[PDB]
Every structure is written in structure tokens, then in C-alpha cells.
Amino acid sequence: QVQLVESGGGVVQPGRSLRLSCAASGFTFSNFGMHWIRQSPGKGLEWVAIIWYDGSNTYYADSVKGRFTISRDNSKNTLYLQMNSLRAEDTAVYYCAKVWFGESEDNYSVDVWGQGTTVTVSSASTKGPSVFPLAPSSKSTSGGTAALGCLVKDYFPEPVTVSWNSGALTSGVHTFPAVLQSSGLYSLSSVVTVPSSSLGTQTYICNVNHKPSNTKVDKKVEPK
Amino acid sequence: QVQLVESGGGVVQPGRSLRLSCAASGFTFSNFGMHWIRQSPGKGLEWVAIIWYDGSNTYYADSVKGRFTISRDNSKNTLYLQMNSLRAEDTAVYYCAKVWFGESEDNYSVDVWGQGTTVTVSSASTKGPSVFPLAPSSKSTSGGTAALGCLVKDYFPEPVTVSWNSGALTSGVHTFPAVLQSSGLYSLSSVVTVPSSSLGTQTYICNVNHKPSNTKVDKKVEPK
Amino acid sequence: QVQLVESGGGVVQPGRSLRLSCAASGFTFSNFGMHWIRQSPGKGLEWVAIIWYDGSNTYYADSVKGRFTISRDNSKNTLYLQMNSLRAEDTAVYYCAKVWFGESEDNYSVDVWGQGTTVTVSSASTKGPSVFPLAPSSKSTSGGTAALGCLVKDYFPEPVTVSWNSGALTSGVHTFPAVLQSSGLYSLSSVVTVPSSSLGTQTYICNVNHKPSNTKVDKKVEPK
Amino acid sequence: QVQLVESGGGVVQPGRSLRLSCAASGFTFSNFGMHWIRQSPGKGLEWVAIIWYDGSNTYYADSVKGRFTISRDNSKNTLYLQMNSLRAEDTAVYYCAKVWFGESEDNYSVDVWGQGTTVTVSSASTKGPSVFPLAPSSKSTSGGTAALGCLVKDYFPEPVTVSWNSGALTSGVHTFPAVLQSSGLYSLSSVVTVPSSSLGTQTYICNVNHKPSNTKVDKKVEPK
Amino acid sequence: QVQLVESGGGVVQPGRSLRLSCAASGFTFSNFGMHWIRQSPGKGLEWVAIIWYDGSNTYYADSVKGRFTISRDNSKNTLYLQMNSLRAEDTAVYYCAKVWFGESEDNYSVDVWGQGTTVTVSSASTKGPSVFPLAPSSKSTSGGTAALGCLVKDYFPEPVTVSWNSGALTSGVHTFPAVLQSSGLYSLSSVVTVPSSSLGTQTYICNVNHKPSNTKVDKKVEPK
Amino acid sequence: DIQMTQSPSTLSTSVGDRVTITCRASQSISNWLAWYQQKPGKAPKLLIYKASTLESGVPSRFSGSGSGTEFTLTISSLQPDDFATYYCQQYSSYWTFGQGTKLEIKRTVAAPSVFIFPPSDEQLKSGTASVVCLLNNFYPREAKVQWKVDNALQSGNSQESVTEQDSKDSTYSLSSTLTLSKADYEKHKVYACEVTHQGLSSPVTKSFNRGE
Amino acid sequence: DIQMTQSPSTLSTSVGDRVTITCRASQSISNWLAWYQQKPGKAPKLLIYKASTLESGVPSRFSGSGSGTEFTLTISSLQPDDFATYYCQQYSSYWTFGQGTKLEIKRTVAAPSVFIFPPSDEQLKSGTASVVCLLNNFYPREAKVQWKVDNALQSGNSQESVTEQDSKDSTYSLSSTLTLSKADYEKHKVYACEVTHQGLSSPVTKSFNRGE
Amino acid sequence: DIQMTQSPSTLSTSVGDRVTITCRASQSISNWLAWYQQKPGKAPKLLIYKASTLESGVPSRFSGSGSGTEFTLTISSLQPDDFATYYCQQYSSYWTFGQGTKLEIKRTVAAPSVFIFPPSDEQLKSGTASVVCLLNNFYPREAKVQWKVDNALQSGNSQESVTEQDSKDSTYSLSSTLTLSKADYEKHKVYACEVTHQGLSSPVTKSFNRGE
Amino acid sequence: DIQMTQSPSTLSTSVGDRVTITCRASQSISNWLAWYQQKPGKAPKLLIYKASTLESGVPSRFSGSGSGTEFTLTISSLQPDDFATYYCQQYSSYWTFGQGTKLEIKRTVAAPSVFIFPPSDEQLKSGTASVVCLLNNFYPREAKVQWKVDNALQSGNSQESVTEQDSKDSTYSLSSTLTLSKADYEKHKVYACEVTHQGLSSPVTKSFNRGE
Amino acid sequence: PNANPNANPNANPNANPNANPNANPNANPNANPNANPNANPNANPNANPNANP
């Protein structure tokens, strides 16, 4: 069926440029107009640009007009978005989308969205995380259930992977989504509830892995 | 931002033709309709013509219907106005203007005006001015202040520049706007108030310059 | 100025179809709605159909609804009226007409009419006329003035021209309008008053011409 | 002439939705407003909704306001009625109707009604009928005339067809209209008067057919 | 059901302008006329303006004629009231209201009122309050009951919130409505009756909050 | 909400008679009243608007009259095509229809033929017992059917159905169905339907014994 | 369908006169009425719209008045170019024209000259017999022509034709044609046309004998 | 052709004042009215559309009001950047602009200084004689200058020119030029210009004698 | 710029329920409205265009309604695959999306289990102090967590994170992280997080002493 | 509720003269599929001046 594959996203410092591409297959790409639409947690879904099938007419959202340039290569079946003068608020997931086929006098929108590519505009430098134990004790025990965890603080960029005991412990694990702090570094926590009767005998180690920095940390969590 | 630059205006004899052009930049020219609007001291602001974004529909004012032809070249981002069979009353400043963006069922007008180009329809031939002194005397003296000037008569076309003592004297200078006479020649005056105690010793010369005829006249004004 | 030229009218047998066209010039045809209005001696002026500037809305008179179809070609600046299943009472002069420009909430009618084209619905076959002399005598003489003429009977279709002495005699000639007979053939008379003292010596010949049948008849009228 | 064809009706469970359509032909549909009017045995004729020719104004009866939505597609010449949150009392025959043409300040109603489509709102499931004999005996004989019949009980939905001897017996047949029972199932009877001297020798079989369930039952009726 | 939401009210200096809006939902807004009605402590209920469903006719009270302009946007379902040259006596709560549906020859008034928005016309500048203690003592004690409070004086504009001991004390609290002083500043008191045996030992603090100035004051009330 | 009311609900008339039906509104509707004709199993057709304007194609024997709150429809000479149901409709404030007046074919009085049918053994095997009382070829339509089970009047457990006027002789037929449980049915012996009609000098009673 | 009616149908007037024609509609058309001028053998030209708005280019001597159902067109001072036919047209509900009012040139009374012509031998050889009665240079237009065959008035077998007003002297000419079969024509002897006109003190009778 | 009219033509105002200008249409234009600001020697800029919608980038001190045929533009507190000419424009039917309202800088009254200049001998040698009357640094702008030649008022042979408000002191200057042929000039003796202004208690008259 | 608004922002519903969400535009968008469904961590999929046209492949339990400025999306019978976020989008003038409505799995109320973790000595040695308050397995999601340091409420120095609904029991977990400098942290003793939830009759307070 | 047959049948001069940004961006399938006789018949100066290769 229709398939769209975005590529080119990543981390870029403010003021620099970035080129997104969208490879189309499963249909005659040169016969359809295309949209670029972005999604951020702060603004939701937000239309960015539209291009005609032949590139003759292009339109842009007011917040990006003059900075973004949409183009296409119908010989390669590829849609392009050149982004210049990036600001912090442009951090979002960008989707390319295909206009549906309709009648000659109707208004048009998109029917098939691409997979999406993440763009992160930040002046933070690549940095590994600090892993601190959230140690269980009597103050974190209610009945036969206790809670312990690992705090993964001050890393950049997303994402990070967390496993427990090399993956042998998955029942009851809650890894919270990361939050962006005022310092531009992300931080999150991963917690697990365990039987209090197992403390001191069962070994619990959280394994944090961060491919962008090649960080691998095995932190042992001991009770107090 | 949006910029419109008119060109092509000048002096034309009645009955001849003239083609004005308007270069647009800063926006997608092919997506907007355009107006030509003229302004004259006798009639004020007066709409001339409108053209659709694709040129399919054009409209003209009744006073110009059948003589003017509005067109556009979207490949060159240029708006054109071919004016034939010009009459004396067509002398005015012509602006191109961009229709604003609105809703589909609204009525439309213009939001951005061009810089404007002056069109002068007259049978007068290019002619340098006659500069005559308006000499101060006892009848033009009240206390320690006297008034003197230069009368710049019978020149065509507009404009002319007047300076005093090569620009060294600017305080108290009043150059009146030119008035068109029954003979089709323009005429104006330039006056300056000077300390009466300087009469007879300080030399005052008015420098009239008329680029269309390459006229440069330095006229000395002597007291009585 | 505004000009409308109808074409396509003629003689058609009942039950057949006919397509009238109206060529417009002197104004932007695509910006105005149009009417077709017919005029017949029996019913006077009678509105037939109206079409919007873009053809989106059409209306028809009750006597023609379901048989006539009005259309337009804005690329050719041509208005069309397809008439099917014609009846005898549809014989009339058909005019196209231009709607005037007015205010948005006013009701509208027509301001400029076309030249008109004649449509004659009859089962009569093309036939040359029969020319009979109206011979003057003592019973058609009062004083010094006598009357003679030519009767042009049983011809189809309209029109026929009558002249006297190849046009040399025009003073006192009265050619009556044609009348439609029960047989579907037209008939008329042409008369002339002459000085009684010229009878028997001056030769009087009526020249009847009927272009549809290429009939030319020169009938000599002698007194009895 | 004017023709309106309703479609979309059927059996729907309470609380579900259903969309009725009305196809118009024989007139300019886009020039007229339309009504939806329903008819039920309990309430008689009951106006439901009205829509303007362009859809700009819509009005609804109080009993349906907020649940029904009337719309139209002038490009398809189709009138629509989306019915949500159906209640038991909405079971009725629904007609679309065309507003008549009148004067500008008159009040308006409908002149041409559609054919009508039946809507039955019930939670009953599709179920074939039970055919029971109405056996003639001495208690159903008066002179030489006897009465026999068939009882068609507990079927849903409407309708069912009843014939006698494959249609060979039609004189004296009375098939009563169906009645709705407390259980939501329909029931009816069909009776026929026959010569008493024919009982025991002439065979009478009633043929019940119920297309919604593809039920075909031939029930033989024997005397007591 | 019918819902009306006013917005736009606030503090405005005399002589300035202010535009109120009323968003309507739950009914066909374009089918009904609307009223603006105001309520003030000095004049009670006072009709302000009325507008027809299509805006063709508007009427105003005599005290506001020539200064207020009522309008509506049926495409946005919004009612507007432009108030110019506001005077001190225009301070009031403004309600939008919907005309009821009735018969053609009846007189009409309103049935559903909006929520209301407060407009305060004053030349006073935004100013935080002065909190003074109303200290209980032997001179304010009768038996086992004493009275204490806080005086919140010379603040602008409304409103202010008063709590006791961060909300821990609510039994017996009386916060008086604010009064407008000759200086244009508001003032009020908050009092509470307490057991006399608790004076000197139980701590009583009034918490005054004024969001327009971001003022938060916790005043301790001590006996004398 | 303007209420509409038509009188009479049913009118028995003959070909050639002068027919007048009335329609009243709960409040003044000026002259904005329309009359619609409907034949059974067929869509309604417009007859009159503005209370007195005849629709194009409608024969002249129809006429309207009335203004304010009282309106009348008159048929000068009834014809066989005019046997139908007539509804009035105000269109002064929204749209409301009257209950409708049905023009009935008047004929001479004909007494009903009464037949009773007991429940079949198959239905008894199914757990239900329906008893059917039939009135055949009677006029006028008004009749009363009372079910008696061991001389005890039944109420709320019967349903009636009436046919339209027969095309050949303009008579009615009526079926009454008394429904009971098998246990209730077997808890009695005699089952009778009593019928009264204006063509009957005395009520007619048909009855059977369970099992007979 | 709104009917329009103009009065008078024909109005005899003179140069310099003040002319007023009226036009009435079967129902209220508000002010949506237009006036059109048509000269013979030429297309109509618009004079007035909205019942009282003068079309651009129309001289000021034309004026309109009226509202509702009665409208008038007034020419303050008639000029020779204004002799034409004037049509009113409502455009409130579709478009319907009146029959038209023709402005006729008033002149002094002139009695007609009457001539009669019998059928030619050639037409009799063709199987038909046409008899022609000619009225020349008469005014006003109203006249009556009666055919008498052996003192018996004819009806339904004659046709009349009238010319327009002569450009030089504003008179009319009329031809009346009696058509008969050769057998009907030869079954009688005397053939007369009798003419009456308001300019004639006595009726004029012309006659001939068949074969003379 | 919809006519537009603005009032007042000129409004003298001061910084901080509340300004209201009006604009009226010859017919109803609904709300399709725009307001444009133009500073001298510069292109116009859009301020308001739909009679009351503020264009993006326009400070909030501008507001529009009005509907039908009367519209107003209000500036709550005038600022020095707002001294310009304001035009209204209907765009309901084609496009027509008003005459424009110029916002003038209000100041105290200052009487003009009057100077007269006779024709130079060189221009007299050239065949023309120009006499110049100068009014310097006056406010307000309204003044009257009458030429008197041997106590005879001149008409149709003079031209006036007025400067804009000076940026430094908000005063006006006016020049009046009387042009005559050498023969007309030498055929008279006394040449005077008389000036009246609201800041002058009595008219000021300057005069010379030809040759004096 | 057309503003879009969806209501409600979050809707708790159960399998088999009838779900209706609304969407409103700041101005009239005719019928040019589309509905998109998005599942978490997945690309959006088109459900409806023209406000009421079902996209090919979409099950019939989805339906659209609305025109002008108010539109609704209705799911007749909710199924587990339909738990996702739904966005409306006007495409009448450019393209703007609503904020989206997330359909949540409704279940019975379950109070949270609360755990607190103090900063490690190693992180304090690193110069930072993070305090973590954990709420486990609660519903609904709405809860309030207040930090109190020596009974003093904190503001502006904490951040919260919430997981999606657990696939097994549809519960939430919430983490609150208080970050402070070592000097601010060591200048106090007691650190508490207080939790209020609709499933708790009384607020729950957890606290520790610094160093204990 | 019907259409006024005498309403304005002309084209509103003060209509929308811009382009509709939401109009059809796709390629029209039933458009002109043939060659254009009056296309460019001259060789292209800036065509490929090298080998294939």
C-alpha cells in the first residue's frame, strides 16, 4: 500500500540548518501534492508546508514563512524540507503526508501520514547521564510491597534505555517519560515494586544504556 | 517583507501610449490579485483596475474602460498596465497594490501599496526655468527681519531643486510647492528670511537645478 | 459599446430541433448573466430563459420548460439556446439580452438587447409566389387618380420584395405586411396610385423577388 | 414531472443511528428548500425538519431537536437525514417533500411528497413466523357458508405475504393488517369464506412468505 | 441547552473604550435577536441595546445612544458591544440575552440570559490593600465570646479573597462585601467570633490575596 | 405549539353529495392553511394552499374557505376518486397537521357474520392459546366485541384489527385475538365472544368448549 | 404568473405634448418595474428601471412614477424621436411584459379613398378567387369593412392588413382580401365592400358585377 | 457609482487628544469599509478593514465603528506619528475613496508676517510682470489675500501656494503670485495685496506704485 | 487564523459505550472538516473527511456529523482498538488542528500507593539534591501533590511525569522530582509530599528527616 | 426557503481574486495526454554536450 519514510532528523543547535527528506512508495508520487506537518507536546499538531504536484505553488505556515523551504524531486520520488534559522520552539516530530484524491472543486487535506522523524533544537552538548539509586527502606514499604528505583538525571539527548537485572525482571516496572529541565538536560526515573520479603537476598541492578554517548551503567540498588 | 516597485512613468504627450510595470517581491506574486490605483490633486484617490491572480478576470473604472489594459506576468512577478489614448486628466501618481488574504465569501480590497510612479500628461516641451530675484527693500522689512527670494517660472517638467548659497543657508527657507499654470508650464517661489543687518554685505545666490533639461542657474539677489 | 448578434434562426418543420447562438462583444461576457426573450405578434413580448454568469443556475418559462435548454460558452463568448420539439406557437423573433449591473440585493432584468433572429415553425414547403394583377378601371377611379397593384399570393417562406419599374417608381407605393393563411402560405398586396391621364400609355410592371426560392417575376399590369 | 425517491430505511435497534437519503429529479433541486415529514399510526402526520435551498438555515421539531441532522448535497441532488439516538416513538414512514414556489413575503409549505420509506425502531430480532390453522367447524358455519383461516404469529419485522392455494383462491379472502404485540412481534390473520358443502373434499392451503427470514410455509387447514 | 458566555470586561479609565463579546451555543444563533442588559447597584436592571437577527434594526437606551454600538457576527456566532466614551456611571455587570420565540404580532423580550461580565469604570490605579488588625480585648468581650478581624482598606480593583489561618478557620467567618469610597478605593472587613478562653494562646492569622496586584498578606491578630 | 383539530374524524358520504369538513387551530393562523389529500398506501397530494387557492391540476369541485381559526373544505359533488383521507396543515408557525378526516363510502346497513376459532393443538403445544373472533362483511364499522371466559369479561388481553372498505361491496371485516397462556387456557372450559352492532337487534354470542 | 396591463393600448399625441401611460400588475411587485422603448423593426431599448431610475444616456424628458400595482411613465415634452412602442415589465417574480403602448402621430381627420378589384382571370384559372378592397390615406386607423355578396354580409372568409403610419403624411392604408373558391365565386353576381369610418359622414359602398 | 464623503475635511488637534472622524456612503455598503493612512510623500498604509477589524501591526489606539452608511474612525490618544491624512474606502461595489481627512497640529494663534515683492526689471524685459505677496509663519491656515490694482480687485489672474506645517514650529507660509503682461502692468499705477486672518484684528495692506 | 477547540479534552469511557466528541471552529468552515485518529507512538490515520464521509477501510461504527462551526464525531459502540487520541482539522483556510481528545479506559477507583525517596549522599556530593515522590497504580489520573519543607509549601522547583495507562490494569503512576542545591537542602530537616486523590477520603502525607 | 430567481446573476467584482490555498494540488488524470504541436521544436542550447557515456 502507500508508504512514506522520513529521514534526516536529529539534534541541531539553534541557528543552524537541517534538511529533512521523505521517501514515497506504493503510489505515483509525482501525481500528488504533499504536506509537512509537525507535532510537539506544547502545540499539538501544527501544519508546516504544502507543495503542489509539480512544485508550482507552495504555502507555509506563518510561524515558519521565510525560514523553511519545501521542495520535491519527482524523478527520485522524494520530498524535501530545508529548514534554516531554527529556533528552540521548532523541536517536534515532523511527518510528511499525502493529499487525498478528490473532486476538482473540493478543498483538500491529507489522508496518509508518514512514519515521522524527530527534530530536537537545543544548544546542549552530548552528555552521559548520572544514575542515582532510589533506595528502598522502611519508609518505602507498605505491607509486603516495597518500591525501589533508579534516577537517570542530566543526559542529552533522548533517548535512554533502562532494563532491570539484564531484562530478567520486567513485571511491575514503570519507566516514566523523560522531562526537559530548565538546564536543557533531560531526567527521568524508573521504579519497580518488589516483595519486601525479598529485600537483602534478591539482587536488583538497573542497566541504563545511552547509544548517542555509548554510556552503559549498571547501578546496584541496596536497601537502607 | 512585501515590496512593490513601480516603474515606467514619465512625460507623455496626449494621445500617445505608455506602459507601467510593477515588480513584486517578498511574497508569492502568482497567488494574489492586484490593483492599480491612482491619486491626483484634483480627484483624490481613484481606483483604476483590478486583475485576478491568474488573469482570468479583469475590471476597470468607467473613466478608463476601453483605453487601459491591465495584465500580469507571473513568471516574471511583474504587473503591467498599458495606457493608450491618454488625456490630460490622467496625470496622477499610480500605485500598484496587493489584495489582502481573506475568507472565501468576503469582499476584498488592498492592504499593501507600492511606492508609486508619477505620470504627467502634457503637451509642454522640456524647458529650463527663468529665475528672477524677489529683492528685499524697505517695503519688505519689519524690524530686524527681511525677506528675499527667487521666482522660478516657466519650466517643464517637474521637479526642480532650489538651494541657497550651495546649501549653506537652510534656516528659515520656505520653498513653496509648484503650481501648474494655464500655459502648461510650472512655476514656484522660494523665500528666506534674513537679518536686516546683513543686507548689502552678505551675498545671497539661489541655485536652481533642473535635471530634465540639465539647467543650472545661480541667480544673485541684491537688496534695494 | 455593447453588441449582441444572434444567428441560427430559420424555417424548421414542427417536431424538429434548432440551436440558436448569440455572439457577444464589447464587454466581458463571462461576467454577466443573459436572457433569451422572444416576441411574436400573437403574444407580444415573452421571456424564455435566463442563465447565470457561470451557468450554475438556469430558469425557464413554463411554456418552454422541458423542451428548451440554454447554455453558454464563456471561452467563445457565445450564448446558446437548444430548442427541441418545436410547436407552431414558438414562431417568433428571439433576442438575447444582457443583464444590467446593479446592487447585490436588487432584482435584475436586461438592459441591452441583441439584434434578434426570426424563427418560423411551419410545415409548409418552400414555394415561389403567385403574382396576380390588380387591374385599374373606371370602378377603381375617383377623379384624376387611379389605383393598380400586384397580389403576391401563396408563397413560403418570408420575405418577398416588391419594386415598381426596377425601383424607379416609389412615390405612392404601399406594400402591405404579409398575412398567414389557413394553408400555411403567406400572401400580401402591393398598390400604387397613378394619374388617370397616364393609363394606357405609361407601362407599369411589378417586380416580385423571393430569394428563398430564387423567384423573380416581372408582371405587367394593364387596365381593363 | 417532479419525482422524489426515498431510500435508506429499515430495521434499527434503539440507540443506534440511521441515515436516510432522498433523490430528486425532474426539477432544479438546488433551487428549493426541502422538508422531512414522518407519519405514524399513533401521531398521524408530524413535521420533522426543514432545510433552506443553500443549507444556510435549518429548523427541527422539538421532539427531534438535537438528535436529527438534516443536510443536502446540491451537487448530487440528494437530501440527507442523519438520525442519532433513535427512540421507539420514531418508528414511522418518512417522506421528503419539496417546498412550493410562491411570493417573496408569503409563508411556505410543501407541495410534492416523496414515495416514503419505512423506519422501524425496535429491539426485536429477526424471527420467522409461526403459522397456526384457524380450523372451521360447526361453530364457524352459518347456513351453507363456513369460515377458515391461518394465524401468522410472532414474526419480525414487517411485512409478510399470505396467499391461498398458490393464488388460485382470491374470492372472499380477507387478510387483516398486522398488529404489534407487547413482545414487539407482529401477528395477523387471514380468513376466507367457503361453501360449507365443500368442506372435507376441497383442499385449502395458506402460503405464508417472509422474505427477511426467507421463510416459506405451506400450512394445510383441516376441519374439526 | 442554551448557553451564553460573555467576555471582555475589566477595568477601564473614563473616556476610554471597551469591546464586549458574547459567545453563543446550544441554539441557532443567527435566527434570534439579542439584547445587552446591565445591572448595577445604583440603578438596578437597565436595558442597554437590542439587535435584530440580521442586524438590520438596532435600538439603544437614551443614556447610551450615540456612544455604544451593538453588532453581531453570525458566521462566528458572536455578539459584540463597542462602548466608547465610558463614564463612571457605566460601571455594571453586563449580560447578553436571547429573545424568546413567539408569534408574529406579539411583543418580545428575553428568556435566556448569559453569565454576565463585570465592567468597572474608574480612574483609580491598581493598588494593593492595607491590612490592619481589629484586635480583640476586654473591651470587645461579652462572656465567653470575643470578636476579632482584619480591615482590608484602600485597594483597587476588585476582588480580594480573605481566608483565616490558610483556610483552617471557617466556622464563624463573616467577610463583608466591599464598599466603594469617595477616593475610588475599596475597603472591607472580615470578622470572626472565637472563645474568649483561647485568646493569647490560639493564633489567628488572616490571609488576604489580591491576584490583580499579586498581593499576599498574612496578618497576625494579637490581643491588647 | 399550535394545535390542529379536524371534524368530523370520519364522514360517511355518497357520490354526488356536497361534503364539508372543518379544521380549527388553537390560535389565529391568519390564512396560512393548506389541505392535503392522501389515498391509502400512497403519498399525500397537495390540494389547496392559502386556505382558498386551488393547486394547478386540481378539479374545480374542490374549494376552500375560512380565516383566523376556523377553516372549511368543500367538495361540491363527490366523485369516486375523492374517497381518501384529508389533512389540514397550518404553516403560520412551524408546521402541524390535523388528525385527518377519512371519507367513507356510505351504503346500506349490513349485519356481521360472526365466527369463532379455538386455538390449534400445535399452538397449545407451543405454550400459548390464541382465540379468534371474526366479524365478516358488516357496515358501518362501529361494533363492540367482548370476550367472556366462563362468563367472566376479559380486559387488556385482546387486540383488534380492521380491514379497509372492500372494493366490491364497501363492507368491513374485523378480527379480535384473545391471547392467554396454556395454563390459563386449560384453567377454563367455555370461551365466548359477544358482538354488538347497529345492524343487530340483539347481541350475538358464539362459544365453544375446550376440547369439544 | 403576474399579468401586466397597459393603458391605453394606443395613444394619439402631438409633438410637444405631455404624455402619460399607465401600467398595472395583477399583484404587488413593489418597485421592480422596468420600461422599454422599441421602434418598429428594431430591438428594444431600456428606458427606466426600479420604476423611477433613469437609464444612463436617456434624455431627462422621460420620467417614471408608481409603486405597488400602479405605475406611470411620463414624457414631459414629446419629440419626434420618441414615437415608438413602450413596454412595461415586472421583474419581481420572473419576467412578464405588458402588451405595449404605441404612440401614434395625431393629425387632422382624413377620409379614406376606396377602390375595389375583382379577381383576375388567371387566378380563376388557378382555381381561386381573391377580391381586394383598398382603403388609402385615412386617419384615424379605426374603420370597418364589410363584404356583401348579393346583399348578404360575409363573415369569417376575409382578412385585413394595415400599413404603418406613412412617414410623409402620417396616414394609414388598409387592404381587405376576400378569398373564395371558383365555384363559390361563380355562384353569385354582385360583390361589394362597404366602408365606415369616423371621418365619413355616410358609409361608402363600392361594388361590381361578376364578369363586367 | 457609490459616493463617499468624509467629515471633517480638516481637523486641528493636539497630542493626547481624542480624535473621531466620520465617513458616509451614498448608499448602504454593509460593513465593507476600509481606512487607510497616508503620510505626505509616502505610500498609503492599511489601518482597518471590515469597518472595525484592526490590521496586524497597527497599534491598539486605533479603532473603527459603524455600519450601513455611517462609519467612524477613533484614535483614543493621538501621538505625533499619527499626524497624517486618513482615507475611507468602500469596497462593496467596485472601489471609491473619500476625499480624505488631514489631521493638523493644533497650536496657538500666530498672525502672518506680510511682505510684497515687485516684478524685477529683467522679467519686465522678458515681457512678463509677476507680483508676489508673501504671508510668513501663520496659523491657522485659513487666510484671504485680495489683489487691488488702482483700488480695483483682481480675479482670475492670481495663483496661491501653501506650504505644509513646519516640522519645527507648525506654522504655514503662503505665496500669492499675480501675473500680468507688460502692457497690463504699465497701464496702471497702484498695486496692493490685502490680507485678512483670524489672528489679525484689522486687515493688513501692502502696496507700491509702478516705478516708485 | 481559524482556532479549533475540542471537547472534552479527556473522556473516560468503557467498551461498548456510545462516545460523542465535539469540535468547534472560531469561524464558519462550511463542511471542510476532517477527523484523524492517533495511537500513542504511532502515526495518525485519517478517519473522516467532509465532516461526514467515511474513509475507505474504516468500520461503520464511526460516524461524523455537523456543519458550519459545530461538528461531532460519534462511535456507536466502542471497541478496544478505538482507544486513541482524536484530532479534528479544518481545511477551509489553510490547516489547523484541534488539541485532541484522548479516550481513556474507565475502571473502578483505586487509591495510589505512595512512596518517597530521599537524595543519595553521592548526589549531594555531586552538588544536587533530588527528592522523589511516587504514586503507584491509581485512577483516575487527576491528583494533587504538594511538597512541604518544614511545613512550607514549595513552588516552581518540582517537575511531574505520568505514564500511560498500563496495558494490564489501566492504572497510572506519577513521579514528582524536587531538585534543590545542597545548601538549600541542608538548611532544613523535614521533607514531605502530600497527596490528594478522589479515591482518598483524607490526604496522605509521607515525610522523612534529613539525615535519618 | 427557495432561490430568488431574480437575484444577482452577474459576477461580484469584489470577490476573492487570490488563489485558493486549499484547492486541488493533485494532478488531473483526465487532462491533456497528447503532445503539443506548438511546443518547442528547436534544439536546446543547454542540453547534454557530452557522451552518454
Residue numbers in the entry:
A (entry chain I), B (entry chain G), C (entry chain E), D (entry chain F), E (entry chain L): 1 to 52, 52A, 53 to 82, 82A, 82B, 82C, 83 to 100, 100A, ...
F (entry chain f), G (entry chain e), H (entry chain g), I (entry chain i): 1 to 212
J (entry chain X): 56 to 108
Sentences from the paper on this structure:
To characterize possible homotypic interactions between 850 Fabs when bound to PfCSP, we performed cryo-electron microscopy (cryoEM) analysis of the SEC-purified 850 Fab-PfCSP complex. A 3.4 Å resolution map of the complex was obtained. While visualization of the map low-pass filtered to 20 Å resolution shows that the 850 Fab-PfCSP complex contains ~19 copies of 850 Fab, consistent with the SEC-MALS characterization, flexibility at the PfCSP C- and N- termini resulted in density too weak to warrant modelling of the five peripheral Fabs in the high-resolution structure. The angle between adjacent 850 Fabs is ~95°, with approximately four Fabs bound per one turn of the spiral. 110 of the ~170 residues in the PfCSP central region are well-resolved in the high-resolution structure and are located in the core of the complex, forming a spiral of 44 Å pitch and 22 Å diameter. Even though local resolution in the core of the map is ~2.8 Å, we were unable to determine which part of the core density corresponded to NVDP repeats, and therefore assigned the density to the high-affinity NANP repeats. The conformations of the 850 Fab and the core PfCSP peptide are highly similar between the cryoEM and crystal structures (all-atom RMSD between the Fab variable domains: 0.4 Å; backbone RMSD between the NANP repeats: 1.7 Å, S11 Fig), with differences only at the extremities of the NANP repeat peptide. The PfCSP epitope for a single Fab can be defined by 11 aa (ANPNANPNANP), with the three C-terminal residues constituting the beginning of the epitope for the adjacent Fab. Adjacent 850 Fabs in the cryoEM model form contacts with each other through three distinct interfaces. The interface between Fab A and B has 375 Å2 of BSA, involves HCDR1 and 3 of Fab A and HCDR2, KCDR1 and 3 of Fab B.
